[PDB]
Each structure stands twice: as C-alpha cells, then as structure tokens.
Symmetry: D2
Subunit: 122 residues, 4 copies
Amino acid sequence: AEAGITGTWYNQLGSTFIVTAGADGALTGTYESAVGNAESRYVLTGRYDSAPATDGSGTALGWTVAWKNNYRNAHSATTWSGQYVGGAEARINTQWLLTSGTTEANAWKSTLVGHDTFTKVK
Amino acid sequence: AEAGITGTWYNQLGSTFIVTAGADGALTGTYESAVGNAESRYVLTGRYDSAPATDGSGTALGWTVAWKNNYRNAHSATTWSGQYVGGAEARINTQWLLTSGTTEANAWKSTLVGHDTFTKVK
Amino acid sequence: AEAGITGTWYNQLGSTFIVTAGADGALTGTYESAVGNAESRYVLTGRYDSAPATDGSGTALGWTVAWKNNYRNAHSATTWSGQYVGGAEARINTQWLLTSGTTEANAWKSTLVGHDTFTKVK
Amino acid sequence: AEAGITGTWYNQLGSTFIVTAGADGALTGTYESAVGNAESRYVLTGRYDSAPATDGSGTALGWTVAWKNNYRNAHSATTWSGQYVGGAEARINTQWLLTSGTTEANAWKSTLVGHDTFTKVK
Ligand SMILES: O=C(O)CCCC[C@@H]1SC[C@@H]2NC(=O)N[C@@H]21
Ligand SMILES: O=C(O)CCCC[C@@H]1SC[C@@H]2NC(=O)N[C@@H]21
Ligand SMILES: O=C(O)CCCC[C@@H]1SC[C@@H]2NC(=O)N[C@@H]21
Ligand SMILES: O=C(O)CCCC[C@@H]1SC[C@@H]2NC(=O)N[C@@H]21
C-alpha cells in the first residue's frame, strides 16, 4: 500500500532507504549505502503494484539507484526487485543486480547479484 | 553528452522500450512486452550514469516496470540492470529480475532472472 | 576444509543437504527439498576450493542437483554457488539458479534465482 | 536417448567445455576459460535430466567448476544452470553464478552473475 511502503527503512548492512509511494504506482526517495564506493544520499526512483492482490500476497516493487550524486560517481547502478510484506513487522525482501560500466572485454564480470532485507522504522 | 540512450529500442523478444534520458540521470518512458501477462504499454522509471568514465566503458543504468496499467495487473515488477554501449550499432545489454507478489510459502520461487539485449533495430 | 564441509546441513526451508568433501575438491551427497516438485533424496555433485586462503575468507564451492530420482522427475536442475564459513557456527551461504526445461517460446521464464543459508548439525 | 550433450562446446568468450553425459544423469569433464584468473583446464562435475519431457522442451542441466588446478587457485567457483536444445544447431543456454571466497565484510559483493551460450562451433 502506499502508506505502508512510505517511510524510512534500513537493511542488514545498515544502509538507509527513505521512500514515498505515489498513488500512480511511483516510488521516489533517497538511498544511503553503508558499503561500496558511495557517500551521502543518492536519488532513487521505482514502481510498485498500487492495486495488489487482497490476500496474504506481498506487493511487488522495484527501484533503481545510479551511484552518482554531487560528491561521488562510482559508474554503476543497482536495481532491487522484491516484495513488500506489511503488518506489525513489515519487511521488503529483495534481490538486486549491481552493474558497473566496463569496457567490452570486461563486460562478463560487470554484474554482482545479492539480496537485502529491509525493516521499517517507526 | 553523446549518450544516444533516448529513443525506441527493441529486445530479442520483440518487446519495445521507449525512453528519454534526462541530463541529470533520470530515465522515463514506456515498455510494451511481447511476452508474459501484459498488454499495451506500461510506465517505466530508472536512473543512468550521466557522467560515465572517459575510457571505453559503457554507461551503467537500470529501470523498473510494475506490470499494472489500465488493461491488466500481473502483480509483478521487473528491474533491468545493465549498460549502454554506443557507436554505429548501439546496444543496451541487461540482466533482469522479475518478482511476482507471492504468499510467504511461495516466496522462495518469487523471482525469475533473465537477460535482454536491446538494439534500435526492430 | 573437507572435514568442515562434510556433514549434514539444513537450510531455512527445512531441506537436508548430506555431503562429503573429497581431497581432490569433489563434493558428492544427496539433497532432500522441503518444497517444490520433489520427493525423497536426489544425488548432488559439486566442487569446492580444497586449498582456500588462510585468512578469515570463506571457501568457495558449488553443487548441482537435477530433480530426477527413481520416484519423481521435475525436469529441472538447481545449482547453488556460495561459500563455506566454518567455526563454532559454520554456515554455507548461497545463491541458486533453478532452471526448468521449457519450449523455446517459454525459455525467457525458465530460471528462478534465490538464496539459501545452511546450518550444520552435530 | 538422442541427447548430443556429450562433446566439446565453446561459448561466446571462446572458453572450451568438454563433457561426457552418463546414462544416469551425470555430467563430467573439463573447462578451460578464455577470461578470468584461470589457465589450462579445470575439472567440472554436474547433473542433467536423463529422462526429459517428450514435448519440445529443452533438457535442464547444471555443472560446477572450482577454479583451482595445478597451475592456479582463484579461490572461486562458478555454477552454470540452463538447458540443452538439440537439433541442427544445438545449444546449451545458461546463466551462471561466480562466487569468490571473501571475508564477512565483503560477502555482499562475493557473487557475479552472467550468461553464456555454448555451441559446437569454435
Ligand atoms: O560500490 C558501488 O558501485 C556503489 C555502491 C553499491 C552499494 C550496494 S547496492 C546493493 C547493496 N546493498 C546496499 O545497501 N549497498 C550495497
Ligand atoms: O508476466 C508478467 O508477470 C509480466 C510481463 C513480464 C514480461 C518480461 S519482463 C523480462 C522479459 N523481457 C521482456 O521484454 N518481457 C519479459
Ligand atoms: O520444483 C522443482 O523444480 C524441483 C525442486 C526445487 C527445490 C528448490 S532448489 C532451491 C530451493 N532450495 C531448496 O532447498 N529447495 C528449493
Ligand atoms: O576469475 C576467476 O575467478 C576464475 C575464472 C572465471 C571465468 C568465468 S566463469 C563464467 C564466465 N564464463 C567463462 O567461460 N569464463 C567466465
């Protein structure tokens, strides 16, 4: 739900995700990573299912962060794909792909894959 | 500069990606999939490295599509992570994650992974 | 180490992994899944780094299970890629790819991606 | 029957995969990578569906290579998951996970993901 997703969330690495869920299915916010070649906040944009299934199914969503801001540029971008599970202890469970810009020769090793779990703070 | 990301692209499945890259790193556009539980166009939003390295590296980028529009709702979302390589034959090489909203018991098989290659040739 | 990997392990879904680490870097054993189109034990074979780095780095390994045994055939195969972290509480952290045999037309949705964490039992 | 998996295959990077498929589902052979921290041949072991569906589906399979041999040790392992499609131009289409042994603090970037297509044409 927009109100359920909107808020501040943190993942197991200590990174911060601040997001606003729009009525049209849009997600905008900022992300601050606790690891990597990153410093300060980065803009994020994404989309979510604004009319999810009325059962105990999660709400599918995804967002992207290109790691360039006014202080640093890592020449990479990460996309998180997952689902929001609301409730008393709402969590957003994701898997992500982090691609670095590389020359053609090194393209085979351009993408890392991982998973992050986010917990919402009050 | 010289980032011919803006335009209409097609992937190996025949899906159509129409995007506009903003000078500050935003990607906005529509996606029409030739496969899956989809019909017509869907809104996409993403981010890209607006200041890539000056060596022969590609430009990292990523975008998301929540598969809900006025015609259908598949209760899923896809994120594409990859890089743009320009020149005579430009391409956007990506790997994607498609997550469907599931119940807790089916969460283990909620995500599909694949790769798409886009060109401006139909 | 072979002795550290050898044993019975269980993951968060309740599946059982029984493996033997060979001196030559081989892994053989059986796997019993708590979910999916599976019943009883399946043969698994894999490889691991038998001469890992002497620091607090994990030992890289991987294994495969084709989901066909004498009782059932799911026409799929899963490969787990990860690292073994030994100690008092040794764990094997992995990410996996599960591919189903499909017709060419449905190949785009043939592979699921996920992650499993295994705990060793005494 | 009619599974021409046994043989020498090459992927788009020029790597060589030599495998023997056993009547009961085992895959054994050697791998020589054209890229990465590798030299010469490495042992691989895997599994495949020895009784695939009788519809036009591919045969699911997977294999692992731990990158240690008498010449080098990269302290990593790769697992390829995919399916074999036979006919005039047979192919093995795969997605892979390459995990490097890391320390706990770098575990988040321990795994690379990519895709390789193998053909019997050099
Ligand atoms: O190093 C880079 O290329 C940019 C920073 C990457 C940080 C990654 S994104 C996925 C994972 N989850 C996080 O919170 N941070 C790391
Ligand atoms: O079936 C669904 O859940 C929605 C449509 C999914 C279409 C996918 S997204 C990745 C791949 N690339 C495409 O162009 N289409 C498929
Ligand atoms: O349903 C199938 O196609 C065969 C069974 C798949 C079980 C999967 S493998 C990855 C995940 N981890 C497990 O322990 N079981 C599921
Ligand atoms: O660099 C390493 O850690 C060992 C060599 C990795 C080679 C990889 S495995 C996936 C991809 N496919 C290949 O044929 N080679 C690269």
